[PDB]
Amino acid sequence: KLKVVATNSIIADITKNIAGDKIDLHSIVPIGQDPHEYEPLPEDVKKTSEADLIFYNGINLETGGNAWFTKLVENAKKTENKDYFAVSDGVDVIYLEGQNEKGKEDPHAWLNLENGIIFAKNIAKQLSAKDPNNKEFYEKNLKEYTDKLDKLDKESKDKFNKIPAEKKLIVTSEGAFKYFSKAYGVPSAYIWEINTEEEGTPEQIKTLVEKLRQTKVPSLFVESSVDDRPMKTVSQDTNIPIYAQIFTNSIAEQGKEGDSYYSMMKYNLDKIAEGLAK
Numbered sequence: 001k002l003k004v005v006a007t008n009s010i011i012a013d014i015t016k017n018i019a020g021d022k023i024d025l026h027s028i029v030p031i032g033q034d035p036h037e038y039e040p041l042p043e044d045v046k047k048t049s050e051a052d053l054i055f056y057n058g059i060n061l062e063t064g065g066n067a068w069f070t071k072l073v074e075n076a077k078k079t080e081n082k083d084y085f086a087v088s089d090g091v092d093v094i095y096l097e098g099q100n101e102k103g104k105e106d107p108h109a110w111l112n113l114e115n116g117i118i119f120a121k122n123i124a125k126q127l128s129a130k131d132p133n134n135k136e137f138y139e140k141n142l143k144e145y146t147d148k149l150d151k152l153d154k155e156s157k158d159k160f161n162k163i164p165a166e167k168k169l170i171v172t173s174e175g176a177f178k179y180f181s182k183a184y185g186v187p188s189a190y191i192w193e194i195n196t197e198e199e200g201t202p203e204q205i206k207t208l209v210e211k212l213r214q215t216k217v218p219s220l221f222v223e224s225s226v227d228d229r230p231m232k233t234v235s236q237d238t239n240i241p242i243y244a245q246i247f248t249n250s251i252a253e254q255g256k257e258g259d260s261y262y263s264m265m266k267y268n269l270d271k272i273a274e275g276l277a278k
């Protein structure tokens with residue numbers, strides 16, 4: 001079987017939905033772990049060295065800071081667009097502070113379903129190229145999978161468009177939902193910008209509190225993977241409740257709610273549409 005390596009559980013789950021049991025799949029960043037600044041273990045080094053095909057997010061998720069993915073593919077003698085592929089190729093990139101320069105791409109593309117569809121298309125393309133015997137199987141699965149994501153995308157856009165505009169604001173700790181905001185027409189507000197060193201300072205908290213007091217947003221949200229003390233403080237200082245915990249960097253453990261890219265996004269979209277209609 002084709003030996004495939006995915007850098008994280010989101011990419012691995014999309015790959016499973018396209019390839020099923022036709023491949024030997026290894027995921028580096030485990031469920032619930034941080035896909036930025038991760039430290040690969042010897043098993044990840046060995047599996048990457050043996051892989052036929054490697055999938056990574058790109059757009060600086062795994063190549064910024066410690067550049068753990070760059071070190072991994074360099075030590076494995078794997079070549080870009082031959083052995084390893086960025087599944088984000090083709091997304092309409094967002095840049096930090098709206099400044100279009102290499103290195104300023106915002107990595108959080110999968111938080112809108114159109115980009116999850118692009119990820120899937122890139123995965124199906126490269127699986128079909130490396131394993132042409134299963135090309136028809138991968139294309140059938142790609143069509144079924146992207147139909148499922150597209151239906152969820154259309155339903156959620158219809159729900160957000162109904163929400164009174166004065167309520168439509170997605171508030172999270174990190175500014176990680178800019179792709180979500182662009183796709184769904186829901187502006188973002190947050191405590192700290194992407195790549196901030198000190199997360200949840202008194203200055204950051206005070207700044208968001210002052211912004212939110214001038215809005216009618218009825219609910220705040222908090223990422224399940226972050227320390228919730230900064231958002232709890234914002235919630236108490238603004239008197240706006242935290243409606244739900246939401247997924248950002250990972251799917252959930254198998255058997256739990258949100259244990260796939262689709263179910264993670266359905267959970268987020270359901271909780272945010274519900275919370276903002278309050």
Ligand SMILES: [Mn+2]
Nearest residue numbers: 108174176194
């Ligand atoms: Mn992030």
